[PDB]
Amino acid sequence: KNIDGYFKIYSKHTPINLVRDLPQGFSALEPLVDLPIGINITRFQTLL
């Protein structure tokens, strides 16, 4: 997410034994890095 010129990333690495879909349950996400990018962001793509 982007807020106040701040780029925020929250992450979680829970072990999942269901390969079909995300399992029913709850696991909160802890923040990792809050780097002050300040570049307005409107698009996103993923690498492999």
């Binding site: 010129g5 701040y6 002050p36």
Partner: protein, 48 residues
């Protein structure tokens, strides 16, 4: 060629050369005003 010379040149640097001709190491620390959230900042001291 006629009225033609290499724009680049090298000056012989010697320890016994004049002080004016002696090379000095020069660093310029260009700054800029606070138009955005600051990232590089001076250390902030903390009391006991």
């Amino acid at each position: 060629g006629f009225n033609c010379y290499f724009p680049l040149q090298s000056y012989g640097f010697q320890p016994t050369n004049g002080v004016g001709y002696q090379p000095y190491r020069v660093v310029v620390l260009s700054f800029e005003l606070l138009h955005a959230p600051a990232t590089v900042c001076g250390p902030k001291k903390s009391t006991n």
